[PDB]
Amino acid sequence: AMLSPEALTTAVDAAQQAIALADTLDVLARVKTEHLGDRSPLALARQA
RNA sequence: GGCCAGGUAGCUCAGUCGGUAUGAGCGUCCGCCUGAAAAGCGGAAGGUCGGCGGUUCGAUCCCGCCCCUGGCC
Incomplete structure (x- = not known):
């Protein structure tokens, strides 16, 4: 999983x-x- | 007045009963191209999925009310 607190930050x-x-x-x-x-870095994160 | 069925991109319409509508055709933008175009080829932008609320870590999809089209009255 690539959604660490320092990843979103x-x-x-x-x-x-x-x-x-x-x-x-x-x-x-x-x-x-x-x-x-829908192509942002936060998009790929929220898509997971 | 009933249980329904519909409102989704600029236009005309599909599609999902929770974490991407990888939406289509045409419309809009950039490149190759042309004196300049278009087609073709290759890239992109744009929807708060009918409104106000409810549930939920998170709702176009589940609850309630209302707005507007229809089918039957």
Whole structure:
């Protein structure tokens, strides 16, 4: 099982950092697809 | 008024009685391509699955109410 507490924290810390570096709404939409869509790292985690 | 059957992507519709709708066709975007296009080929974006709540670690799928189409009245 690859859902350790430091595994999800590695994804959230990388997601919130990219969200913090989103300066326009178009960039945020691209970040949303990579960190909250059905192909995000959290997606493969929640799919298991 | 009854037990049902339906509301799902921009359009027209499939599909699942709990952890991915690997959704389809067409519509939208990028690349190869063309003077520029389209087709073709190869990549992608986009749905809070009818609304408000209930159960649950987690609900398009299970409970209750309501909204709107139909079938029978």
